[PDB]
């Protein structure tokens, strides 16, 4: 499901080497290391990201995300 769509409000590297983003008021974390710089690039450039997961409760995990420009 599409859990959240919008710009990245903040990102955060976590002590367990997971990575959190806040999108449309909701926070999600990923353990996929490859997503860390990609999400940062998206955050820096104001990409619209779509967090996709089987669970969309804020604080849940994700491993699928779409990147869109304006």
């Amino acid at each position: 499901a599409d859990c959240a769509k919008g710009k990245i409000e903040f990102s955060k590297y976590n002590e367990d080497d997971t990575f959190t983003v806040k999108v449309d008021g909701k926070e999600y974390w990923t353990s996929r290391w490859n997503l860390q710089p990609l999400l940062q690039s998206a955050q820096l450039t104001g990409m619209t990201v779509t967090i996709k997961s089987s669970t969309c409760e804020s604080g849940s995990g994700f491993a699928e995300v779409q990147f869109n420009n304006d």
């Binding site: 290391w33 490859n34 997503l35 860390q36 710089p37 940062q40 690039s41 820096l44 450039t45 104001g46 990409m47 420009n69 304006d70």
Partner: protein
């Protein structure tokens, strides 16, 4: 050409700076409102300079009036200072190409870089305080200075005077923040990390702003502008990038990304990473 910068009041100070800008630069077509613009320094031959006479350190009084700054016109660098009482031009070592007629030229061992000046001055620009009082102290230090090698107090004086003349000419932000110190309250201006970063990114800003065509934002390294009022409130004069400080590497000034004008080198500098898992495991 000679210009006065009169520190008597905020009015006289801003008027002085505006007159200099009008004479030495031309507004950008796309960053100009009324007579308040980001302006490009008009081309002059290398070695061209203008003189700045310092006035009004004591409000509206014809005293403390023997300091002149020599400013290379194409880049607004301070090449040195003149004691007009002794008719002596103390010239930094990186400006042997600047020749001023009619004065005794003292060629100094000290170069003008902020690295050198901060070292000799034992004073960091980030957090540096400037007041009417310390500008008077700075003036007296420069009038007492003699010899071919900058002293600590002469270096502190140059740091303060370059900030409130050349850097304020470049950045309307520094003009606005510093001018409060000239009011009757006599508060202290403290140079901020953001002020310092502006001065460190002048050339990069200068390469990017001529390309602006009303994008929703401008990003140049650590510098961000979100609208035209932020640009105008921050920047007043830029280099003519048609100067070595304009280009770092490559040949592409800007990339438009999501309606924001980026310095291309900034984007390249965070888009040059390989796959993160491969990076971190490949030790």
């Amino acid at each position: 050409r000679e210009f006065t910068i009169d520190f008597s009041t905020q009015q006289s100070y801003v008027s002085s700076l505006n007159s200099i800008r009008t004479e030495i630069s031309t507004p950008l077509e796309h960053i100009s409102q009324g007579t308040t613009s980001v302006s490009v320094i008009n081309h002059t031959p290398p070695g061209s300079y203008f003189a700045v006479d310092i006035r009004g350190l004591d409000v509206y009084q014809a005293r403390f009036d023997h300091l002149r700054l020599i400013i290379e016109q194409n880049n607004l660098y301070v090449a040195g200072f003149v004691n007009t009482a002794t008719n002596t031009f103390y010239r930094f070592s990186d400006f042997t190409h600047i020749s001023v007629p009619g004065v005794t030229t003292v060629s100094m061992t000290t170069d003008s870089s902020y690295t050198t000046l901060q070292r000799v001055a034992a004073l960091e620009r980030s957090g540096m305080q400037i007041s009417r009082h310390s500008l008077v102290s700075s003036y007296l230090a420069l009038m007492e200075f003699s010899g071919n090698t900058m002293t600590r107090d002469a270096s502190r004086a140059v740091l303060r005077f370059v900030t409130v003349t050349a850097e304020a000419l470049r950045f309307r932000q520094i003009q606005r923040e510093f001018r409060q110190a000239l009011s009757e309250t006599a508060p202290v201006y403290t140079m901020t990390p953001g002020d310092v970063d502006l001065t460190l990114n002048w050339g990069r800003i200068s390469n990017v702003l001529p390309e602006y065509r009303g994008e929703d934002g401008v990003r140049v390294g650590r510098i961000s502008f979100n609208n035209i009022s932020a640009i105008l409130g921050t920047v007043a004069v830029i280099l003519n990038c048609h100067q070595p400080e304009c280009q770092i590497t490559g040949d592409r000034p800007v990339i438009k990304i999501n309606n924001t004008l980026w310095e291309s080198n900034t984007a390249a500098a965070f888009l040059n990473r390989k796959s993160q898992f491969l990076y971190t495991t490949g030790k």
